[PDB]
Amino acid sequence: GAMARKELSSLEELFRHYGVRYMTLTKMVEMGFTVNTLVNMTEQELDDVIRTLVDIYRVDLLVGEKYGIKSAVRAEKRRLDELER
């Protein structure tokens, strides 16, 4: 209950300014995604999850929302790598 709220806040923070809508975030939390998992996934694995959201989970994704999930993860990966220096 509080754990699901913590995960949603975590994803809201990651995807803020990337056009990911509330119901897309809600579905990702329900699927069990965390920020740490997403930053360690490949570009191809992120493409597969995006396809899974539409095909299996029937989430309605805008075109910019699909590009937004990938851009938010790329930016976070670059922020973490630059920090590691």
Numbering used by the authors: 51 to 135
Provide the publication's sentences verbatim:
Here we focus on LEAFY (LFY), a plant-specific TF essential for flower development. LFY is one of the few master regulators of flower development, as it integrates environmental and endogenous signals to orchestrate the whole floral network. Structure–function studies have demonstrated that LFY binds semi-palindromic 19-bp DNA elements through its highly conserved C-terminal DBD, a unique helix-turn-helix fold that by itself dimerizes on DNA. In addition to its well-characterized DBD, LFY possesses a second conserved domain at its amino terminus (LFY-N).
After heterologously overexpressing LFY-N domains from different plant species, we were able to determine the crystal structure for GbLFY-N from the gymnosperm Ginkgo biloba at 2.3 Å resolution. This structure showed that the GbLFY-N monomer is made up of five α-helices separated by four loops. Comparison against the Protein Data Bank revealed a strong structural similarity with the SAM, also called Pointed domain28, a resemblance that could not be predicted from LFY-N sequences. Some SAM domains are able to self-associate as oligomers through the so-called mid-loop (ML) and end-helix (EH) surfaces. GbLFY-SAM appears to belong to this class: in the crystal, it forms a head-to-tail polymer with monomers contacting their neighbours through two polar surfaces. The ML surface comprises negative and polar residues, including T72, T75 and E83, which interact with the positively charged EH surface through hydrogen bonds and salt bridges, in particular via R112 and R116 (residue numbering refers to LFY from A. thaliana—AtLFY—sequence). Size-exclusion chromatography coupled to multi-angle laser light scattering (SEC-MALLS) showed that the WT GbLFY-SAM domain formed oligomers of variable size in solution, depending on protein concentration, containing up to eight monomers. In comparison, all mutations affecting the interaction interface completely abolished LFY oligomerization and GbLFY-SAMTE, GbLFY-SAMRE and GbLFY-SAMTERE proteins were found to be exclusively monomeric. However, when mixed at an equimolar ratio, the GbLFY-SAMTE and GbLFY-SAMRE single-face mutants retained the ability to interact, forming a GbLFY-SAM[RE+TE] dimer, thus showing that the different mutations did not alter the overall fold of the SAM domain, and that single face mutant proteins still displayed one functional interaction surface. These results further showed that the head-to-tail arrangement observed in the crystal structure reflects the state of LFY-SAM in solution, which forms an oligomer of limited size in the conditions of this study. Our results demonstrate that LFY-N is a Sterile Alpha Motif (SAM) domain that mediates LFY oligomerization.
